Structures are given as structure tokens and as C-alpha cells.
Design an enzyme around this catalytic site. Structure first.
Site, PDB file in Angstrom:
ATOM      1  N   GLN A  93       0.808  -1.213   0.000  1.00 30.68           N
ATOM      2  CA  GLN A  93       0.000   0.000   0.000  1.00 30.68           C
ATOM      3  C   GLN A  93       0.844   1.267   0.000  1.00 30.68           C
ATOM      4  O   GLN A  93       0.353   2.321  -0.416  1.00 30.68           O
ATOM      5  CB  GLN A  93      -0.945  -0.035   1.205  1.00 30.68           C
ATOM      6  CG  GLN A  93      -1.977   1.073   1.226  1.00 30.68           C
ATOM      7  CD  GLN A  93      -2.999   0.935   0.114  1.00 30.68           C
ATOM      8  OE1 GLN A  93      -3.404  -0.171  -0.239  1.00 30.68           O
ATOM      9  NE2 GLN A  93      -3.413   2.061  -0.449  1.00 30.68           N
TER      10      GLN A  93
ATOM     11  N   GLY B 209       3.961   1.213  -1.518  1.00 24.78           N
ATOM     12  CA  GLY B 209       4.946   1.032  -2.563  1.00 24.78           C
ATOM     13  C   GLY B 209       5.933  -0.078  -2.283  1.00 24.78           C
ATOM     14  O   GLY B 209       5.580  -1.093  -1.684  1.00 24.78           O
ATOM     15  N   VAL B 210       7.188   0.139  -2.682  1.00 25.11           N
ATOM     16  CA  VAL B 210       8.193  -0.919  -2.738  1.00 25.11           C
ATOM     17  C   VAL B 210       8.737  -1.212  -1.344  1.00 25.11           C
ATOM     18  O   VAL B 210       8.948  -0.301  -0.531  1.00 25.11           O
ATOM     19  CB  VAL B 210       9.326  -0.511  -3.698  1.00 25.11           C
ATOM     20  CG1 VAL B 210      10.419  -1.566  -3.744  1.00 25.11           C
ATOM     21  CG2 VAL B 210       8.777  -0.279  -5.089  1.00 25.11           C
ATOM     22  N   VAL B 211       8.974  -2.496  -1.079  1.00 28.21           N
ATOM     23  CA  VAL B 211       9.614  -2.968   0.140  1.00 28.21           C
ATOM     24  C   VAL B 211      10.839  -3.787  -0.252  1.00 28.21           C
ATOM     25  O   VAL B 211      10.780  -4.611  -1.173  1.00 28.21           O
ATOM     26  CB  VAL B 211       8.655  -3.833   0.994  1.00 28.21           C
ATOM     27  CG1 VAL B 211       9.309  -4.238   2.326  1.00 28.21           C
ATOM     28  CG2 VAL B 211       7.315  -3.118   1.230  1.00 28.21           C
TER      29      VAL B 211
ATOM     30  N   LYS C  97      10.663  -0.345   4.038  1.00 30.01           N
ATOM     31  CA  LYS C  97       9.582   0.210   3.233  1.00 30.01           C
ATOM     32  C   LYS C  97      10.041   1.554   2.692  1.00 30.01           C
ATOM     33  O   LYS C  97      10.382   2.454   3.470  1.00 30.01           O
ATOM     34  CB  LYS C  97       8.331   0.438   4.068  1.00 30.01           C
ATOM     35  CG  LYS C  97       7.664  -0.783   4.669  1.00 30.01           C
ATOM     36  CD  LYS C  97       6.291  -0.341   5.179  1.00 30.01           C
ATOM     37  CE  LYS C  97       5.668  -1.329   6.117  1.00 30.01           C
ATOM     38  NZ  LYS C  97       5.412  -2.579   5.418  1.00 30.01           N
TER      39      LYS C  97
ATOM     40  N   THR D 114      11.948  -2.239   9.556  1.00 28.86           N
ATOM     41  CA  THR D 114      11.359  -3.195  10.489  1.00 28.86           C
ATOM     42  C   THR D 114      12.124  -4.511  10.481  1.00 28.86           C
ATOM     43  O   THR D 114      12.975  -4.775   9.626  1.00 28.86           O
ATOM     44  CB  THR D 114       9.882  -3.475  10.178  1.00 28.86           C
ATOM     45  OG1 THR D 114       9.796  -4.306   9.012  1.00 28.86           O
ATOM     46  CG2 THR D 114       9.108  -2.190   9.955  1.00 28.86           C
TER      47      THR D 114
ATOM     48  N   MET E 147      11.383 -11.028   8.165  1.00 24.88           N
ATOM     49  CA  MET E 147      10.786 -12.336   8.389  1.00 24.88           C
ATOM     50  C   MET E 147      11.018 -13.177   7.138  1.00 24.88           C
ATOM     51  O   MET E 147      10.403 -12.943   6.089  1.00 24.88           O
ATOM     52  CB  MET E 147       9.306 -12.143   8.691  1.00 24.88           C
ATOM     53  CG  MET E 147       9.059 -11.218   9.885  1.00 24.88           C
ATOM     54  SD  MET E 147       9.519 -11.973  11.444  1.00 24.88           S
ATOM     55  CE  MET E 147       8.146 -13.096  11.623  1.00 24.88           C
TER      56      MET E 147
ATOM     57  N   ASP F  88      -5.923  -3.549  10.610  1.00 25.06           N
ATOM     58  CA  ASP F  88      -5.899  -4.343   9.379  1.00 25.06           C
ATOM     59  C   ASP F  88      -5.267  -5.700   9.680  1.00 25.06           C
ATOM     60  O   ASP F  88      -4.390  -6.185   8.970  1.00 25.06           O
ATOM     61  CB  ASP F  88      -5.183  -3.607   8.247  1.00 25.06           C
ATOM     62  CG  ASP F  88      -5.455  -4.206   6.865  1.00 25.06           C
ATOM     63  OD1 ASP F  88      -6.176  -5.225   6.765  1.00 25.06           O
ATOM     64  OD2 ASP F  88      -4.935  -3.651   5.867  1.00 25.06           O
TER      65      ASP F  88
ATOM     66  N   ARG G 169      -2.490 -11.930   5.595  1.00 27.84           N
ATOM     67  CA  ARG G 169      -1.566 -11.202   4.728  1.00 27.84           C
ATOM     68  C   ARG G 169      -0.678 -10.219   5.496  1.00 27.84           C
ATOM     69  O   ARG G 169       0.395  -9.854   4.985  1.00 27.84           O
ATOM     70  CB  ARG G 169      -2.329 -10.456   3.643  1.00 27.84           C
ATOM     71  CG  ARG G 169      -3.260  -9.366   4.162  1.00 27.84           C
ATOM     72  CD  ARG G 169      -4.009  -8.621   3.063  1.00 27.84           C
ATOM     73  NE  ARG G 169      -4.967  -7.725   3.706  1.00 27.84           N
ATOM     74  CZ  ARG G 169      -6.161  -8.102   4.154  1.00 27.84           C
ATOM     75  NH1 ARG G 169      -6.604  -9.344   3.955  1.00 27.84           N
ATOM     76  NH2 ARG G 169      -6.928  -7.241   4.805  1.00 27.84           N
ATOM     77  N   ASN G 170      -1.118  -9.755   6.676  1.00 31.22           N
ATOM     78  CA  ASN G 170      -0.358  -8.818   7.502  1.00 31.22           C
ATOM     79  C   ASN G 170       0.238  -9.493   8.732  1.00 31.22           C
ATOM     80  O   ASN G 170       0.521  -8.828   9.733  1.00 31.22           O
ATOM     81  CB  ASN G 170      -1.218  -7.620   7.869  1.00 31.22           C
ATOM     82  CG  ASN G 170      -1.572  -6.786   6.645  1.00 31.22           C
ATOM     83  OD1 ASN G 170      -0.746  -6.629   5.735  1.00 31.22           O
ATOM     84  ND2 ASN G 170      -2.792  -6.263   6.595  1.00 31.22           N
TER      85      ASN G 170
ATOM     86  N   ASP H 105       2.614  -4.448  10.539  1.00 27.53           N
ATOM     87  CA  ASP H 105       1.924  -3.310   9.942  1.00 27.53           C
ATOM     88  C   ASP H 105       0.775  -2.787  10.800  1.00 27.53           C
ATOM     89  O   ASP H 105      -0.140  -2.137  10.296  1.00 27.53           O
ATOM     90  CB  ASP H 105       1.539  -3.621   8.491  1.00 27.53           C
ATOM     91  CG  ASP H 105       2.770  -3.832   7.616  1.00 27.53           C
ATOM     92  OD1 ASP H 105       3.510  -2.858   7.405  1.00 27.53           O
ATOM     93  OD2 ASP H 105       3.036  -4.969   7.190  1.00 27.53           O
TER      94      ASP H 105
ATOM     95  N   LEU I  78      -0.762   1.111  10.768  1.00 29.78           N
ATOM     96  CA  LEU I  78      -0.378   1.868   9.585  1.00 29.78           C
ATOM     97  C   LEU I  78      -1.557   2.235   8.703  1.00 29.78           C
ATOM     98  O   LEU I  78      -1.449   3.189   7.918  1.00 29.78           O
ATOM     99  CB  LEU I  78       0.692   1.125   8.788  1.00 29.78           C
ATOM    100  CG  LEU I  78       2.080   1.040   9.428  1.00 29.78           C
ATOM    101  CD1 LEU I  78       3.015   0.284   8.518  1.00 29.78           C
ATOM    102  CD2 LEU I  78       2.690   2.427   9.761  1.00 29.78           C
TER     103      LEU I  78
HETATM  104  C1  LIG Z   1      10.668 -14.263   1.173  1.00 28.95           C
HETATM  105  C2  LIG Z   1       9.998 -12.998   1.646  1.00 28.95           C
HETATM  106  C3  LIG Z   1      10.292 -12.527   2.909  1.00 28.95           C
HETATM  107  C4  LIG Z   1       9.514 -11.386   3.029  1.00 28.95           C
HETATM  108  N1  LIG Z   1       9.471 -10.610   4.171  1.00 28.95           N
HETATM  109  C5  LIG Z   1       8.782  -9.435   4.379  1.00 28.95           C
HETATM  110  C6  LIG Z   1       7.938  -8.832   3.562  1.00 28.95           C
HETATM  111  C7  LIG Z   1       7.342  -7.692   3.910  1.00 28.95           C
HETATM  112  C8  LIG Z   1       6.370  -6.967   3.027  1.00 28.95           C
HETATM  113  C9  LIG Z   1       6.585  -6.954   1.660  1.00 28.95           C
HETATM  114  C10 LIG Z   1       5.676  -6.295   0.840  1.00 28.95           C
HETATM  115  C11 LIG Z   1       4.572  -5.654   1.379  1.00 28.95           C
HETATM  116  F1  LIG Z   1       3.714  -5.033   0.540  1.00 28.95           F
HETATM  117  C12 LIG Z   1       4.339  -5.651   2.732  1.00 28.95           C
HETATM  118  N2  LIG Z   1       3.216  -5.010   3.315  1.00 28.95           N
HETATM  119  C13 LIG Z   1       3.063  -3.684   3.295  1.00 28.95           C
HETATM  120  O1  LIG Z   1       3.937  -3.013   2.744  1.00 28.95           O
HETATM  121  C14 LIG Z   1       1.891  -2.999   3.921  1.00 28.95           C
HETATM  122  C15 LIG Z   1       0.875  -3.534   4.503  1.00 28.95           C
HETATM  123  C16 LIG Z   1       0.046  -2.669   4.989  1.00 28.95           C
HETATM  124  C17 LIG Z   1       0.399  -1.406   4.722  1.00 28.95           C
HETATM  125  S1  LIG Z   1       1.843  -1.310   3.892  1.00 28.95           S
HETATM  126  C18 LIG Z   1      -0.391  -0.183   5.147  1.00 28.95           C
HETATM  127  C19 LIG Z   1      -1.810  -0.551   5.543  1.00 28.95           C
HETATM  128  C20 LIG Z   1      -1.813  -1.753   6.474  1.00 28.95           C
HETATM  129  C21 LIG Z   1      -1.214  -2.977   5.792  1.00 28.95           C
HETATM  130  C22 LIG Z   1       5.242  -6.303   3.548  1.00 28.95           C
HETATM  131  F2  LIG Z   1       4.993  -6.281   4.866  1.00 28.95           F
HETATM  132  N3  LIG Z   1       7.554  -7.114   5.104  1.00 28.95           N
HETATM  133  N4  LIG Z   1       8.416  -7.703   6.017  1.00 28.95           N
HETATM  134  C23 LIG Z   1       8.599  -7.055   7.316  1.00 28.95           C
HETATM  135  C24 LIG Z   1       9.049  -8.820   5.692  1.00 28.95           C
HETATM  136  O2  LIG Z   1       9.840  -9.377   6.503  1.00 28.95           O
HETATM  137  N5  LIG Z   1       8.766 -11.147   1.939  1.00 28.95           N
HETATM  138  N6  LIG Z   1       9.118 -12.183   1.086  1.00 28.95           N
HETATM  139  C25 LIG Z   1       8.466 -12.162  -0.248  1.00 28.95           C
END
Ligand SMILES: Cc1cc(Nc2cc(-c3ccc(F)c(NC(=O)c4cc5c(s4)CCCC5)c3F)nn(C)c2=O)nn1C
Ligand SMILES: c1ccc(P(c2ccccc2)c2ccccc2)cc1
Length: 266
Positions: free
Chosen positions: A20, A22-24, A38, A82, A85, A129, A133-134, A147, A150
């Protein structure tokens, strides 16, 4: 007042996808510690608002929370740093490992999440949320909640409006869909849906219903069915999260006690 991490200390290593904001990315801090970074897309977040309350979020410290380590706010885009994982989000983890889980492991995952949420509840901090997925999974299979809070800073009407295409309708109680009344009890409802996600091994709640159909039907009393792998005692726990009236839903302290009792029984 949060920890202002020096961006020079971050090494970017891999793309983890887009959310939500962008890029992580996956990277390291000072060459040693795995982190997730993030990179907040311009216009996607109420940034000054987030910065005001980042220290409160950082003060949340629990083993089963994906920790906010700090922020980088001295350039654009800003970064949120953060805990990393390695096994990614819980929904994909459930779906990819579906045929390997024993029922005890399903209950343990629920316990992990319940512990994190009991901690948030004790700090009067709303997730807003909560969903598989979170939640994220580390290299030893421990589930942690990510998250939290957020949602409050998202700039995207499709996510923030209860009739938007991105709003978490399927994890929301009637008072959220009708009045935007978020509370510890709307997190309770979402946790029940998360338990169902776990025990169904990553099925989509209310599959084949649209969001508006889900909202219509849960307001009239429809509830998620018992997954095959959920015992009656487990189903009673998740179903208690879905009382129409918020004040009849349990607390996370009660839910954790119920989960421990089932573990003791088994
Ligand atoms: C193999 C592997 C390990 C790994 N580890 C992690 C992925 C992500 C992560 C990646 C992309 C994301 F799109 C998000 N979510 C968001 O950005 C948001 C969620 C929400 C937002 S923003 C605002 C509103 C409330 C919900 C992620 F949390 N984070 N963390 C801490 C990891 O450790 N990914 N993979 C593929
Ligand atoms: C001692 C060392 C590291 C840690 P955290 C940490 C938080 C922010 C910046 C850098 C590190 C940690 C991070 C990744 C893996 C394990 C621990 C806690 C105590």
C-alpha cells in the site's frame, strides 16, 4: 522521537514486492542485521501524521510483533525499517505448506498472533488491518503480527473508504462497515477471521461473494463455516469473535486463555 536510522547504514539486497506504500526491500543494517525497508511512495502516506506517532509504534515491543526498528525521514522517499521475516507473509505460507501442517501447529500459530494482539490491547493500540496477509513468518516458523496501526496513514480512497475496492471488508465487523467504529473489538473480529484463515489453510473468507455481498450478509447474520481441521473447541473460540454486538466479544486476554486451555486439553 523515534530512532532516526542513518540511511548510510542500510544495504539494499533484494526486492520483497509492493504494498500500500509502494516498494519494500530486504537489506542489512550495519552489514549484519537483516531488515525490511519500506520505501514510502510519494503521495501514498500521510507522512507528517505518521512521523508524529512513530515513537509510540516503536515503543511496542513484543516477540510476536514484527518490530518497528526506526525511520529515515531526512530525504524523500522516507523509509520505515522493520524486523525481517524470512518466510514471508502467513497467507502465502499457509497456501504453500498446506499439506504439511499438523493441527497442533495451526493452534500454535493462532497463539502467536493472540499473544501479539493481547500485548497491543494492553497498550490500547489498534491494529486496524489484522489478517493473514499482515502476519509474517520467520525462519523458525514463528508467526508475528506486522503493519499494526499503519492503516491510519494510508492516502488511497479505495483503501480508506468502507466501500472502496481495497478496504478489508472480509475482516471487518458490522460497526466498522456501518460506522467506521474501530476498537479493540474490531481487531477481535478480524482475529477470528484470521483463525479461520489459518484453519482453512489459507482459503479466502467468503470466497465467491463480493465485498458488498459479504457486508450485506454478515450484517444479516452470515458467519464463516467451521474448517475441517478445526475442532469444536477451536471453532467456538473463533466464532466468539463474531458476536454482532461488540461488547459481547471477548478480549484478547480471554482468547489467549481459551487457546492455552485447548493446548492443555490436548
Ligand atoms: C521471502 C519474503 C520474505 C519477506 N518478508 C517481508 C515482507 C514484507 C512486506 C513486503 C511487501 C509488502 F507489501 C508488505 N506489506 C506492506 O507493505 C503494507 C501492509 C500494509 C500497509 S503497507 C499499510 C496498511 C496496512 C497494511 C510487507 F509487509 N515485510 N516484512 C517485514 C518482511 O519481513 N517477503 N518475502 C516475499
Ligand atoms: C541487539 C542487537 C540487535 C537488535 P535488533 C535491531 C534493531 C534496529 C537496528 C538494528 C538491529 C535485530 C535485528 C535483526 C536481527 C536480529 C535482531 C537488538 C538487540
Amino acid at each position: 522521537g523515534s530512532w532516526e536510522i542513518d540511511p548510510k547504514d542500510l544495504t539494499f539486497l533484494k526486492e520483497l514486492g509492493t504494498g500500500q506504500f509502494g516498494v519494500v526491500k530486504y537489506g542489512k543494517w550495519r552489514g549484519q542485521y537483516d531488515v525490511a525497508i519500506k520505501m514510502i511512495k510519494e503521495g501514498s502516506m500521510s507522512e507528517d501524521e505518521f512521523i508524529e506517532e512513530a515513537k509510540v509504534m516503536m515503543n511496542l515491543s513484543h516477540e510476536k510483533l514484527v518490530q518497528l526498528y526506526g525511520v529515515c525521514t531526512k530525504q524523500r522517499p522516507i523509509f520505515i525499517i522493520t524486523e525481517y521475516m524470512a518466510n514471508g507473509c502467513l497467507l502465502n505460507y499457509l497456501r504453500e505448506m498446506r499439506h504439511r501442517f499438523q493441527t497442533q501447529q495451526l493452534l500454535e500459530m493462532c497463539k502467536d498472533v493472540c499473544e501479539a494482539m493481547e500485548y497491543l490491547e494492553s497498550k490500547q493500540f489498534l491494529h486496524r488491518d489484522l489478517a493473514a496477509r499482515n502476519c509474517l513468518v520467520n525462519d523458525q516458523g514463528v508467526v508475528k503480527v506486522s503493519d499494526f496501526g499503519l492503516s491510519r496513514y494510508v492516502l488511497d480512497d479505495e483503501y480508506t473508504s468502507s466501500v472502496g475496492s481495497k478496504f478489508p471488508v472480509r475482516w471487518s465487523p458490522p460497526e466498522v462497515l456501518m460506522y467506521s467504529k474501530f476498537s479493540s473489538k474490531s481487531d477481535i473480529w478480524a482475529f477470528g477471521v484470521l483463525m479461520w484463515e489459518i484453519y482453512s489453510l489459507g482459503k479466502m473468507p467468503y470466497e465467491r461473494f463480493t465485498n458488498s455481498e459479504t457486508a450485506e450478509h454478515i450484517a444479516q447474520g452470515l458467519r464463516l463455516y467451521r474448517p475441517h481441521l478445526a475442532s469444536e473447541k477451536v471453532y467456538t473460540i473463533m466464532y466468539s469473535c463474531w458476536h454482532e454486538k461488540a461488547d459481547e466479544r471477548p478480549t484478547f486476554k480471554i482468547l489467549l486463555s481459551n487457546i492455552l486451555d485447548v493446548m492443555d486439553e490436548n
